[PDB]
């Protein structure tokens, strides 16, 4: 039993390498830059005589005022990495059926946004490029998956200039020759900045959707990226850590392939053997999509677009977020694997066996718990669906019910929306999920603990 210490020291070396490699991914200016860009926009009010900012847009003229005053003020102080772009998606007149009774008063109807109802037709003063429908592929876009619906990559677009003299002119022309009519359903603003002394450039995508029932709904996405500003101070150390991480992964994979191939005919008959293979494959994928991401960022180190073309950096942001998520999962599993090295203790070996002997019962209880949880969530969605703003969608009903458990109920508007069947939901939920269903978890655990300890006592103390 000397290989246990070898595994322990190897795992500690791996963990110390990984902790440094993940502390190197917690730079201060990757989060503060986003927090300062999301306040440079989205918080500064309209030019003057208004207090509403982008976060509290309320009408179409408010959007026009934001585009003229606040947008053209925060972009230009007194780099852009190319040029900003603005796009519109709209629907077709007469795309739905007005009932015959309500006629002679309601002439036209505009259906809610859908690909089957979107129009592809020319506009009025049709001399620019912002008055002809260009196909989805010609705009180099895929989708957005917004709030109300999901929007295509097509639309009517207009590339802006690079200054307050050839930019505000076309915006004013668009406002004069009316562009956002009743048929508009979505408006996008896309651009990158690269205004940070450290490379750390971020792309931004602003959406304003006009629902089929009046009003505006704003949304925003800020996404910073990475570059290779290699210096002898801390960066060579992190490169060495990365390459030794790759060496550790190679050693682990050749080790595991050796044992799986040469003996036991099957490695997947435990829990620690079905976990490290997952860690290894996740690490391989992360290394691959990190090398590819670095190669992709390498070429685009241009900063010489000369306001002639619009950069398209969403393909890089997708890989960025995928790598971040996969690394976060890998680090978590690496930390979880630590239990194998402390489970063989004098007093820690009666709780591990207890929690492994009752896993089937715990899963069986969890299914029963979740069925009732989802039934309550659906009932709350059907009852308080249109009023409470907490139970507005199913994904929010579930997350609200998970917050009533943590002692965060509001109950001020639950009772206001429905005086009867509002309290009945709340009191019954509390009773049947705190007194009856959270006592079925500790019951299973207690029974398993008692029987395991009795068996261990009658085994050890007898022999």
């Amino acid at each position: 039993l000397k290989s246990v210490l070898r595994e322990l020291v190897t795992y500690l070396l791996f963990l110390i390498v990984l902790c440094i490699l993940t502390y190197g991914m917690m730079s201060s200016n990757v989060y503060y830059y986003t927090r300062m860009m999301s306040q440079l926009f989205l918080d500064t009010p309209v030019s003057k005589t208004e207090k509403t900012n982008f976060k509290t847009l309320s009408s179409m003229e408010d959007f026009w005022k934001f585009t003229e005053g606040s947008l053209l003020d925060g972009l230009y102080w007194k780099l852009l990495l190319g040029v900003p772009r603005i796009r519109q998606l709209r629907v077709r007149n007469g795309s739905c059926s007005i009932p015959q009774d309500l006629r002679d008063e309601i002439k036209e109807c505009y259906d809610v946004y859908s690909v089957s109802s979107e129009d592809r037709a020319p506009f009025g003063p049709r001399n620019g490029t912002a008055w002809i429908y260009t196909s989805e592929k010609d705009l180099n876009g895929s989708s957005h998956w917004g709030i109300i619906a999901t929007y295509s990559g097509a639309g009517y677009y207009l590339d802006l200039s690079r200054t307050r003299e050839e930019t505000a002119a076309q915006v004013a022309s668009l406002k004069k020759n009316v562009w956002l009519d009743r048929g508009t359903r979505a408006t996008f603003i896309d651009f990158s900045v690269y205004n940070a002394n450290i490379n750390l450039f971020c792309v931004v995508r602003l959406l304003v959707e006009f629902p089929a029932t009046g009003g505006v709904i704003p949304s925003w996405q800020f996404q910073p990226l990475k570059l290779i500003r290699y210096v002898t101070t801390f960066d060579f150390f992190l490169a060495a850590c990365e390459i030794i991480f790759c060496f550790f992964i190679f050693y682990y994979v050749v080790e595991e392939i050796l044992e799986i191939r040469i003996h036991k005919l099957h490695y997947f008959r435990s829990f620690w053997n079905c976990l490290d293979v997952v860690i290894v494959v996740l690490s391989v994928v992360a290394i691959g999509i990190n090398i590819y991401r670095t190669s992709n960022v390498e070429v685009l180190l241009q900063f010489l677009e000369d306001q002639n073309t619009f950069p398209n950096f969403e393909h890089l942001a997708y890989w960025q977020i995928q790598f971040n998520n996969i690394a976060a999962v890998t680090v978590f599993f690496v930390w979880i694997k630590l239990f194998k090295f402390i489970n063989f203790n004098r007093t820690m070996s009666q709780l591990s066996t207890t929690m492994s002997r009752c896993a089937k019962d715990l899963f069986g209880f969890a299914i029963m718990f979740f069925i009732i949880f989802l039934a309550y969530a659906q009932l709350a969605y059907l009852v308080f669906g249109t009023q409470v703003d907490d139970f507005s969608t199913f994904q929010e009903c579930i997350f609200t019910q998970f917050r009533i458990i943590l002692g965060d109920i509001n109950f001020a508007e639950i009772e206001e929306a429905n005086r009867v069947l509002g309290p009945i939901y709340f009191t019954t939920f509390v009773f049947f999920m705190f007194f009856i269903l959270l006592n079925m978890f500790l019951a299973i655990i207690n029974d398993t603990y008692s029987e395991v300890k009795s068996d261990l006592a009658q085994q050890k103390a007898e022999m």
Binding site: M26, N324, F332, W335, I342, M348
Partner: protein
Amino acid sequence: SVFGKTLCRALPELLGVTLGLVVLGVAYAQLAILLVS
């Protein structure tokens, strides 16, 4: 006289559970950061 004895003999098990929760909490904290924040 049994309360002190049962609080003294059952101390190692509670300490081991606390250690396990500390480890499982630092792992979850490390996942929480870096994921979106």
